[PDB]
Each structure stands twice: as structure tokens, then as C-alpha cells.
From Swiss-Prot:
The lineage of its organism: Bacteria, Bacillati, Bacillota, Bacilli, Bacillales. It comes from the Bacteria. This is Protein AroA(G). Disulfide bonds: none annotated. Coiled coil: none annotated. Transmembrane segments: none annotated. It comes from Bacillus subtilis (strain 168). The gene is aroA. The chain holds residues 1 to 86 of 358 of the full protein.
Length: 86
């Protein structure tokens, strides 16, 4: 592989990193707005049926190179961060 090709692939990866960052943050703003609406609780409510449905739907759309468990784990981390935000 040439040095130019290595740089091109790594620049694509960096651009994708930044786009993922942008979408995670936009999602964060959304989930904060949703949190504003909910009723105050002793611990951050994430309805389990909605969560399990969301995860399974994400998995249904998983045609990428990662196993479904990997995708599920990453999106559980994203979700948890969101909850902390609320």
C-alpha cells in the first residue's frame, strides 16, 4: 500500500470520527430536551421495553462488518451517556 493510500484511508476515518461525534452530540441535545419533559425520579428512567425495541431495531439494520453484540454494546454505551446527561 502506498503512503498516499494510507493517508487517504486515515483521513476518511478521521472525517467519519468527526461526523459520528456530531451526530452523538446532536442526539445528546435531543435526549436532554426529552429529559426536560419527564417527571423527576430518584434514578434516570429509561423504559426497558422502548430500549430493547430500539436496540433490536438497530440490530435489524446492522449490515456492517461488526457482530450484532458489538453494535449492541456500543449503542448501550451511547444510550447510558445520554441518560447521565438527563
Amino acid at each position: 500500500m502506498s503512503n498516499t493510500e494510507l493517508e487517504l484511508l486515515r483521513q476518511k476515518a478521521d472525517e467519519l470520527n468527526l461526523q459520528i461525534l456530531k451526530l452523538i452530540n446532536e442526539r445528546g441535545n435531543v435526549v436532554k430536551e426529552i429529559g426536560k419533559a419527564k417527571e423527576a425520579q430518584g434514578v434516570n428512567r429509561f423504559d426497558p421495553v422502548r430500549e430493547r425495541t430500539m436496540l433490536n431495531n438497530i440490530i435489524e439494520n446492522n449490515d456492517g462488518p461488526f457482530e450484532n453484540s458489538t453494535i449492541q454494546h456500543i449503542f448501550k454505551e451511547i444510550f447510558k451517556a445520554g441518560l447521565e446527561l438527563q
